[PDB]
Amino acid sequence: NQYDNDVTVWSPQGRIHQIEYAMEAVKQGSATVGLKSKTHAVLVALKRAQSELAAHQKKILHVDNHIGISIAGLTADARLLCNFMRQECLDSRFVFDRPLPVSRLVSLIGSKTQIPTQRYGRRPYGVGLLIAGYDDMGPHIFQTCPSANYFDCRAMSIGARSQSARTYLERHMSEFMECNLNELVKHGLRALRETLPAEQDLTTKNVSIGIVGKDLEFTIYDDDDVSPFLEGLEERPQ
Amino acid sequence: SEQIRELREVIELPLTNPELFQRVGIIPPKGCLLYGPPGTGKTLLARAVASQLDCNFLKVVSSSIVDKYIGESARLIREMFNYARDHQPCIIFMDEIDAIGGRRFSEGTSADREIQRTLMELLNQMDGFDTLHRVKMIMATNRPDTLDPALLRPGRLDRKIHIDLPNEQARLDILKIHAGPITKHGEIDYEAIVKLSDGFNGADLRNVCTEAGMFAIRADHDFVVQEDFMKAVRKVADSKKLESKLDYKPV
Amino acid sequence: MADGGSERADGRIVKMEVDYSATVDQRLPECAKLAKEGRLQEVIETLLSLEKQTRTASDMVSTSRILVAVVKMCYEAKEWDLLNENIMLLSKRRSQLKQAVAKMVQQCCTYVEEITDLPIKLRLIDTLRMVTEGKIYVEIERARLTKTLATIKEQNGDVKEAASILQELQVETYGSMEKKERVEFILEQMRLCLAVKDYIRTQIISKKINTKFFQEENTEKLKLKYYNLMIQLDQHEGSYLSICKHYRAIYDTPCIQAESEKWQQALKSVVLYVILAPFDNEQSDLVHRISGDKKLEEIPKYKD
Amino acid sequence: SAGFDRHITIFSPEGRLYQVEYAFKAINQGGLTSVAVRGKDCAVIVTQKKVPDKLLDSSTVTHLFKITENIGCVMTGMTADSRSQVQRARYEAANWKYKYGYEIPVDMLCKRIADISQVYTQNAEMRPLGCCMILIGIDEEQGPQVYKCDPAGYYCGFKATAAGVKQTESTSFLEKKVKKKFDWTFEQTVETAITCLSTVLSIDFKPSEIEVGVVTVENPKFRILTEAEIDAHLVALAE
Amino acid sequence: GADREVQRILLELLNQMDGFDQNVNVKVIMATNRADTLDPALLRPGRLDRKIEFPLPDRRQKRLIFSTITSKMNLSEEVDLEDYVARPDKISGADINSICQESGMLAVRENRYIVLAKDFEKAYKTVIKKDEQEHEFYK
Amino acid sequence: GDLVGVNKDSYLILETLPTEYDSRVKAMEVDERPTEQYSDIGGLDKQIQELVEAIVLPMNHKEKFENLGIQPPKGVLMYGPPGTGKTLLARACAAQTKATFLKLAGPQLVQMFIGDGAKLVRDAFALAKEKAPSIIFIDELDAIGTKRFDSEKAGDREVQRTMLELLNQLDGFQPNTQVKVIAATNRVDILDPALLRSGRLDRKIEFPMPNEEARARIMQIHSRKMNVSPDVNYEELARCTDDFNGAQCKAVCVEAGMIALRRGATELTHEDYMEGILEVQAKKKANLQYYA
Amino acid sequence: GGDNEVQRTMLELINQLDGFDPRGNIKVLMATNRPDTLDPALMRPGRL
Amino acid sequence: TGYDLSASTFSPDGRVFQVEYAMKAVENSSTAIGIRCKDGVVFGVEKLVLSKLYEEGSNKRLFNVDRHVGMAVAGLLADARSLADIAREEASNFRSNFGYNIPLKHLADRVAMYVHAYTLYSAVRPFGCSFMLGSYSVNDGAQLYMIDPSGVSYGYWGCAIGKARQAAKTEIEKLQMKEMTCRDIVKEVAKIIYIVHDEVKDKAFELELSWVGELTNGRHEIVPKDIREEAEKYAKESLK
Amino acid sequence: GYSFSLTTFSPSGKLVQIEYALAAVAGGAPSVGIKAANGVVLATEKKQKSILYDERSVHKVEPITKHIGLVYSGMGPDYRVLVHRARKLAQQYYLVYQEPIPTAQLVQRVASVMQEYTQSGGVRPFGVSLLICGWNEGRPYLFQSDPSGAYFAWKATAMGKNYVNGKTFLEKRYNEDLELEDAIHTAILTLKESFEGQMTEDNIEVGICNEAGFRRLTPTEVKDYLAAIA
Numbered sequence A: 001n002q003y004d005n006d007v008t009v010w011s012p013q014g015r016i017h018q019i020e021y022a023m024e025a026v027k028q029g030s031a032t033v034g035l036k037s038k039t040h041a042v043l044v045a046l047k048r049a050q051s052e053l054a055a056h057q058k059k060i061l062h063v064d065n066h067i068g069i070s071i072a073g074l075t076a077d078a079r080l081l082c083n084f085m086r087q088e089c090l091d092s093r094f095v096f097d098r099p100l101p102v103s104r105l106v107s108l109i110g111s112k113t114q115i116p117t118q119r120y121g122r123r124p125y126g127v128g129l130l131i132a133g134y135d136d137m138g139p140h141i142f143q144t145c146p147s148a149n150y151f152d153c154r155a156m157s158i159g160a161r162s163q164s165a166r167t168y169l170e171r172h173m174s175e176f177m178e179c180n181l182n183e184l185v186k187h188g189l190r191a192l193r194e195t196l197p198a199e200q201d202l203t204t205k206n207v208s209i210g211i212v213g214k215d216l217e218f219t220i221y222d223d224d225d226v227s228p229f230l231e232g233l234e235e236r237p238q
Numbered sequence B: 001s002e003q004i005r006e007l008r009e010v011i012e013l014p015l016t017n018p019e020l021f022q023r024v025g026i027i028p029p030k031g032c033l034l035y036g037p038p039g040t041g042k043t044l045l046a047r048a049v050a051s052q053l054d055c056n057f058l059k060v061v062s063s064s065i066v067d068k069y070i071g072e073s074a075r076l077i078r079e080m081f082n083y084a085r086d087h088q089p090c091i092i093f094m095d096e097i098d099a100i101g102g103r104r105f106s107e108g109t110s111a112d113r114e115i116q117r118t119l120m121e122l123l124n125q126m127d128g129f130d131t132l133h134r135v136k137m138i139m140a141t142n143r144p145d146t147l148d149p150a151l152l153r154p155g156r157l158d159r160k161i162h163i164d165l166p167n168e169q170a171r172l173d174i175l176k177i178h179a180g181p182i183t184k185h186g187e188i189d190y191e192a193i194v195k196l197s198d199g200f201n202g203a204d205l206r207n208v209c210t211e212a213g214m215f216a217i218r219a220d221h222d223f224v225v226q227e228d229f230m231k232a233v234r235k236v237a238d239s240k241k242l243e244s245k246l247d248y249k250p251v
Numbered sequence C: 001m002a003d004g005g006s007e008r009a010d011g012r013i014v015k016m017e018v019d020y021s022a023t024v025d026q027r028l029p030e031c032a033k034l035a036k037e038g039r040l041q042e043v044i045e046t047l048l049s050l051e052k053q054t055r056t057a058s059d060m061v062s063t064s065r066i067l068v069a070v071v072k073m074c075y076e077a078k079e080w081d082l083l084n085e086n087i088m089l090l091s092k093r094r095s096q097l098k099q100a101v102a103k104m105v106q107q108c109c110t111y112v113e114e115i116t117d118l119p120i121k122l123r124l125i126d127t128l129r130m131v132t133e134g135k136i137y138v139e140i141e142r143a144r145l146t147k148t149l150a151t152i153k154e155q156n157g158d159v160k161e162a163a164s165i166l167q168e169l170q171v172e173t174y175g176s177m178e179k180k181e182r183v184e185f186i187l188e189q190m191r192l193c194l195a196v197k198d199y200i201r202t203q204i205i206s207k208k209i210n211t212k213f214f215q216e217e218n219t220e221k222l223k224l225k226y227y228n229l230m231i232q233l234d235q236h237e238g239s240y241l242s243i244c245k246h247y248r249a250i251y252d253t254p255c256i257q258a259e260s261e262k263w264q265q266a267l268k269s270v271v272l273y274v275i276l277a278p279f280d281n282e283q284s285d286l287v288h289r290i291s292g293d294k295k296l297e298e299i300p301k302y303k304d
Numbered sequence D: 001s002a003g004f005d006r007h008i009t010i011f012s013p014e015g016r017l018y019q020v021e022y023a024f025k026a027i028n029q030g031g032l033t034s035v036a037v038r039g040k041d042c043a044v045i046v047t048q049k050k051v052p053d054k055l056l057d058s059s060t061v062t063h064l065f066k067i068t069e070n071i072g073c074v075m076t077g078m079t080a081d082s083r084s085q086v087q088r089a090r091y092e093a094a095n096w097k098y099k100y101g102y103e104i105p106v107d108m109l110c111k112r113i114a115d116i117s118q119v120y121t122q123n124a125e126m127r128p129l130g131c132c133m134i135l136i137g138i139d140e141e142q143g144p145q146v147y148k149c150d151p152a153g154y155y156c157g158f159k160a161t162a163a164g165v166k167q168t169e170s171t172s173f174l175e176k177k178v179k180k181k182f183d184w185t186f187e188q189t190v191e192t193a194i195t196c197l198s199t200v201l202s203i204d205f206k207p208s209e210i211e212v213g214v215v216t217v218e219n220p221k222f223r224i225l226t227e228a229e230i231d232a233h234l235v236a237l238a239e
Numbered sequence E: 001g002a003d004r005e006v007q008r009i010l011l012e013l014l015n016q017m018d019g020f021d022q023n024v025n026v027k028v029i030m031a032t033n034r035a036d037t038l039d040p041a042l043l044r045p046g047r048l049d050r051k052i053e054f055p056l057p058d059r060r061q062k063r064l065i066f067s068t069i070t071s072k073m074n075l076s077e078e079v080d081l082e083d084y085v086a087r088p089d090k091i092s093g094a095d096i097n098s099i100c101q102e103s104g105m106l107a108v109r110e111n112r113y114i115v116l117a118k119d120f121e122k123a124y125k126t127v128i129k130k131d132e133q134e135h136e137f138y139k
Numbered sequence F: 001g002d003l004v005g006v007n008k009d010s011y012l013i014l015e016t017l018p019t020e021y022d023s024r025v026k027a028m029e030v031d032e033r034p035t036e037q038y039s040d041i042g043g044l045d046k047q048i049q050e051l052v053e054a055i056v057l058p059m060n061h062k063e064k065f066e067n068l069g070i071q072p073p074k075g076v077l078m079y080g081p082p083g084t085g086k087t088l089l090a091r092a093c094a095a096q097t098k099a100t101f102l103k104l105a106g107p108q109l110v111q112m113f114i115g116d117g118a119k120l121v122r123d124a125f126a127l128a129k130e131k132a133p134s135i136i137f138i139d140e141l142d143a144i145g146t147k148r149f150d151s152e153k154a155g156d157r158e159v160q161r162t163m164l165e166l167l168n169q170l171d172g173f174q175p176n177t178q179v180k181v182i183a184a185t186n187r188v189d190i191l192d193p194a195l196l197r198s199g200r201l202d203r204k205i206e207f208p209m210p211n212e213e214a215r216a217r218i219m220q221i222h223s224r225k226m227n228v229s230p231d232v233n234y235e236e237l238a239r240c241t242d243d244f245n246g247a248q249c250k251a252v253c254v255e256a257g258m259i260a261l262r263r264g265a266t267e268l269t270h271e272d273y274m275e276g277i278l279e280v281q282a283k284k285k286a287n288l289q290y291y292a
Numbered sequence G: 001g002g003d004n005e006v007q008r009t010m011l012e013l014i015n016q017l018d019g020f021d022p023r024g025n026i027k028v029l030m031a032t033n034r035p036d037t038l039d040p041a042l043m044r045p046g047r048l
Numbered sequence H: 001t002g003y004d005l006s007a008s009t010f011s012p013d014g015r016v017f018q019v020e021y022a023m024k025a026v027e028n029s030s031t032a033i034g035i036r037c038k039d040g041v042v043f044g045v046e047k048l049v050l051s052k053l054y055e056e057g058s059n060k061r062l063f064n065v066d067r068h069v070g071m072a073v074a075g076l077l078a079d080a081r082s083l084a085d086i087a088r089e090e091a092s093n094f095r096s097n098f099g100y101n102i103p104l105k106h107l108a109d110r111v112a113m114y115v116h117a118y119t120l121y122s123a124v125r126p127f128g129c130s131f132m133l134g135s136y137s138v139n140d141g142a143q144l145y146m147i148d149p150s151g152v153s154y155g156y157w158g159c160a161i162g163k164a165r166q167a168a169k170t171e172i173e174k175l176q177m178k179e180m181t182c183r184d185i186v187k188e189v190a191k192i193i194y195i196v197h198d199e200v201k202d203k204a205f206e207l208e209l210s211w212v213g214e215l216t217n218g219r220h221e222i223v224p225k226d227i228r229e230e231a232e233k234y235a236k237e238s239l240k
Numbered sequence I: 001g002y003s004f005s006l007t008t009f010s011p012s013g014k015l016v017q018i019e020y021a022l023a024a025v026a027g028g029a030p031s032v033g034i035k036a037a038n039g040v041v042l043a044t045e046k047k048q049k050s051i052l053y054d055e056r057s058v059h060k061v062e063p064i065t066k067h068i069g070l071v072y073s074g075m076g077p078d079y080r081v082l083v084h085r086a087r088k089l090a091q092q093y094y095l096v097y098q099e100p101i102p103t104a105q106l107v108q109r110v111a112s113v114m115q116e117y118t119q120s121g122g123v124r125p126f127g128v129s130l131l132i133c134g135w136n137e138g139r140p141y142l143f144q145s146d147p148s149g150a151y152f153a154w155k156a157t158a159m160g161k162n163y164v165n166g167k168t169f170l171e172k173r174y175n176e177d178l179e180l181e182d183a184i185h186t187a188i189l190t191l192k193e194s195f196e197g198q199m200t201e202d203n204i205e206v207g208i209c210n211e212a213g214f215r216r217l218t219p220t221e222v223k224d225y226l227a228a229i230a
């Protein structure tokens, strides 16, 4: 436990515990699910209420006309990386007059979060980014981690009890490349309902859906346009 | 053996042969200090000389003689010398003096004052008012850089002697002794073993002779082939390299 | 791999006379490069000592005559050169020196009974001069011990030979197979110090002996050589009871060796000078022990 | 002990400080030994190599480091600290030639190296570079020189030099060696530079296990010997 | 706890040394190492009247300890310890014993009754060889 | 130390009828006891084979160690991070080796009776010496295996009487067949390894933390005896476990079943194991208003 | 390192706590203010 | 121990455990080997699939530093990414200041001094990475380098980094690499990866082979192993 | 608990770390300074470990200006720092005032340098005391600084190992006036007081201050004084 104080101190087993603890901060946030077809990348998140009459805290947030991100973890590092995220996108619009490739944007984030994981005097960023995008080579789903190991993936779910969503996605990932915009969304929100205790239901007021498409700008829906998506579902198999 | 002969004059020759010390006219039954990094020889020399015309040899680990209550560590030292005055030829052996040897200083308030009073009892009952007669003391520690100068002055520990780990030729000697009563074919390239062997410890060389036997028992051989040694040398050299904090800095 | 060295060994031991002797020295560096090799199983040290065993034996056939200057000069130039193709230590500490030098003193054990003093003391000094500074440590020590015990019998003892062995006693007590060989070697120089009439030197080294007591058990002639020097040492002094206590050991050992006159010399030496001791209670009980015996009436000094 | 736990670079009541004198035993984890000898107009570095693997190369192992055209050196201690020590030596040798317009003396270079090591002792918050450096060079109206620089910031110049694991044994030889009056005629030097090391370690190489740097007042360039001429001197002292 | 037990053993010692009773004809002899450490209540006279310091030796007392040890010793030479009376790097009085003891070992070690004055220097360098590194550093 | 029958006035021994005690020493006799497979233990087949090289091959090749010119060891020491693998492997050892097993625990020696630690040490060893194939088990010997450098060993008046008498008897008997002695401790760094070193407890058998699949099957073996819902993802159970021994893995399974008793449900779930995970190290969650 | 009439009570109760209780009917509850005095042998399952 | 928190302190015997600790974090990484033929350098990485949702070429450990230089990292992957950007940036300054391509002997010196600087100060930690450097030129031939976390850098003919560092170079050294062409090497790298630990304690892995030499005209790129698939066709023949 | 840092006090007395640094001065080589009627004599003790070390490489008596010399007793590598500091600081006077700096004026300033390393909190103080000499405006001067930052003026003093014997010697051995030659004869006699071996021309090293400037002696000059030295 005497090695468990700073980011600088290695362990006698080779495992820095402060990075291992920031992984646990990602599991404090709610679950969120991202996936993609050949033409459409959809990420769906789960809101959480603070009280009975307060508004639900938002998860999906717009970045650029072809990139939107989800969130899990500390809200301090959420807006801190978002302001770095939005700044880099409009610089490529200002200098190169093109949108950024999504892949090389994420490499800037890994270089960003690397330095506070090695120098003393700054904690790592406890955060759980899921990124959807469109470069010239189609849709992408990316995840990051506070250990700065960014992963390319075709479907992913992170947050609290998000393993049950992953087991759903493995037995349906073959079906995802061919379906259209419509059931791809409700392939995705069939995965969130296993990250719920079986006594409550996925309503309108607690879920957000963001879609970016090949000919579609990144659009966030909430609480009213979710009802065309929530129709055509079965109940839970109890 | 060069240190062994120097050990035997000051310990064996008093109790076996006092007439030589009366020709020139000289006393000493005093005792030695064996300093040298651990594993080499610091106990066997004590045990070898405690076989040649033996008597009631003692063994003290010098770390079981400390506990909570304050007047007990002196009480053990007083008793062990009273036993030595009981049986008149006697050899005291105390490994790792550095535990209670130490040096005196200003304030260590809680624990250190007991240790120094434990030390002064030991320091002044082997050179006390009573003449310690017919009793010899062998002190052995792997550390000693910090000992009490009152412990180190000649008169109490009259001659010190150093013990080194290798030679490449004492390596040749220890290997032939521990690979002594072991059935083989005489196919033993001892030197190329010793060339590969950086064992630094006859306990490691005892381990090499132990493991080379075990690989000979593997695949059911009544002999020992020379390859069983090279399997044993690579295992023992690997097992040594898997250890940390193994400092070698004596005086 | 060393079977080529075996058919090298086949070639030389027939052709020492058919071929010239320097051709054996032309086969020298190839076996010396084999002596470098000694790797795993085939050209290893154990077989490498054998080709050195053959060339030393073939040299002793050639240098069996008084022309001994081949075997001495080639061997020294061998061990120098195979160091000199390298640095520090020859090829291995064990074989190539000490198994060959064990044969050197073995061959010296054979030719000592015939050859004159000159080429053997050239031979003994050239194995002195190689174990003085070169290959001198343990592995092995007893080979020079038995060599310097053979070195000392040349001029049969003088001032030089006593000092020649006193310099080489003090080391050889660490081990030296203490079961006879050290004990025989350590009583050899005390008669030498009696020959140079150094009596204080003798009784210091005589005081070393007796902890190997009961040496009458397996051997017998070790005992008599000890006390016959012990009685001579005090004979320059006078502790006359101490010789008679020694003579008791001289009495009871050849009695079981069944002597009829040699036993009587030991008996009549006892009965002579317990008398010459000054009077003491130790004289009184000793004459009460040594008299009244059925072995003693043979002499008119029973009455004395 | 009095026991300050010696965690940083401060004093002890005995009067000394332990972290710097822990760096002197930091050399010993190299497992290596180096010898410099100055006898006459020539000066000789000699140092063994240790190649443990056949996959490992041979050319990229050498500890002989050419500082300038007329100044070479050898490094002991741990490897990574040794090469960064050389980079300051190559750098400040070139600032001398730039600022002052002539070639730097071998004596002045060790003052610059030892003063860099002094600041790390005086001021904290940098590990003090556990490696040792031995130099050679020719100086006009001075002959050749040999210098050693310590991790404490100490330097001195002296004739026969040992470093690495076996200082006390090799220096015990050279006192017994350099007490007579020799003239050291460049094969007298190289032979003892072998045979000082050729009482110590008991090895026997075929001639590919050492390195020899040399400098001479007939060609003051620094010079690393060829494997062939190493073999020549290895049988030239050696009959 | 138990450090005031040490401290009260002082006080009982101070009482039965200078209390009311004044136990006559008893005598107290004490001997320590470095005595600047201890209690000034001991050091007041009336209780510890005599303050006697022992130096190591000095010169002209090295001679006297050389005499008294070698008197009962078969030195019997013409090579004197005068070279080793006047050495610096002072040598405590128990060490003079060890010099004669080591030479006594080293006389019998080559089987002599006599000290032949080359052993005497081997004995001298054995007992005196202590400070060996100093790292050529802090002078 | 015998309970001899002495006359009142003459103070002379008339009878003895000694050695009368209580049911704890009676409870030490375990012979021909049920079978746990070595193959049930996964991933530690080395330490199984190392034990065969240590003890079983002495029993197999009794004379191959005698004509060769070496000595079979008689002290083999098991150690690891925690148990479930210390007792459990030793439970696997005498399950299929039937040669008169004899277990013994640590503080069972510790009595209020002075010296009857050392009396019970020697008399059980001498009883095991009277049996011809009997091997000796010692459980939690680190309870007296002590004497580390500064802070511990605390005294004592039972540790030294039991440790020395252990060192007394273990040097007493010859190291041949078949009175091999096995000690079971937790950690060598509490023990005295270099004091034993030669003919005493010498062979070091280290244990690691078990693997994911090993902990996953430890769940299903322990969950056999209860009503479990047959919707169990052991891949979920393998990876969710971390820094858990099989003792805690048994505890998770029992705590999952106890929570299903709290709500009165007949079956389990993986969440019930996850709730058991929160119950073992006493975790408790909420909404924490940092995390959106 | 006690063993003066406290352990007489203690060793006898832990003797009779197991041994005579597989599948019992009488439950026993302990209560204290000091969590120092927890026995892991009690907390070994079967007892507590 | 109790002397091993900072990397600025020595042990009482004279070493730094924070460097010692970071070396055996690389030991838990998967095995990546390297080998050079007489006209090029061939890399090879055993890389294992995380679960299933890896997308077939994500987070690769074969980097591309310059036109003719690439890396074969192993250890903490994110720490190697930042370290690779140092090497990418270092070759650009040599191009801008000297007008030609960076020599590999000089490039390894510039990186290893930068790795060395993190082994001194208490404010930073040492890197938890180790990697390979391969290149090829017509004026210099092929070279192959090796950098530990301490900063020690020198050249090999074959090497391995990972769990089976010893268990791989046991059978690298039984190859006559001085005369083989690198097209023959590619099928020989395939068996060395496939010999050690296909799916024993793991589930699945995937092979990555980088490739520089005379056949690529000095370029450094991935093999066309989607072409001809000859690695797995030949490595899986060692089942018997 | 106060003996590990520098920026805080003890509840009763003074700074602990500066007192520990003065213990390092006592474990240095011995050195003697004597102020005569017309000059100042410095003298030190220079024994090498082995025969191998060259004596003409490193010097102890060291000039600062043409009339200002300087020795020490402490740690040699820290000595070279503040020598090079005192060199450059002596020129800065001369660039301003076009006049050689008086010996009272350096020791104002050199002590202010040694002052600054006694500040907070991650630096160590020096382990060197100094002896500074010079002949400015007829009268000579002999000063002594320390790692604390104080500075004085001795008639004669000694520092290093066994200084208390040399203090008691020179307390008996000083008068008001001798010549510069008789000061040299009594400065070697006090260095011989605590010495181990044959004092040759290379075991010691002596520099003086005339009114005609500062100079250190050659080994031939130091031989001929040590030849027939009492």
Ligand SMILES: Nc1ncnc2c1ncn2[C@@H]1O[C@H](COP(=O)(O)OP(=O)(O)O)[C@@H](O)[C@H]1O
Pocket (backbone or CB within 6 Å): B037, B038, B039, B040, B041, B042, B043, B044, B174, B177, B201, B202, B203, B204, B206
């Ligand atoms: N020179 C040697 N000759 C014979 N045995 C040796 C030698 N050196 C070590 N050993 C073996 O090593 C073991 C450890 O020796 P020991 O004296 O206990 O080490 P230490 O000196 O540290 O106490 C012994 O059992 C002994 O058999």
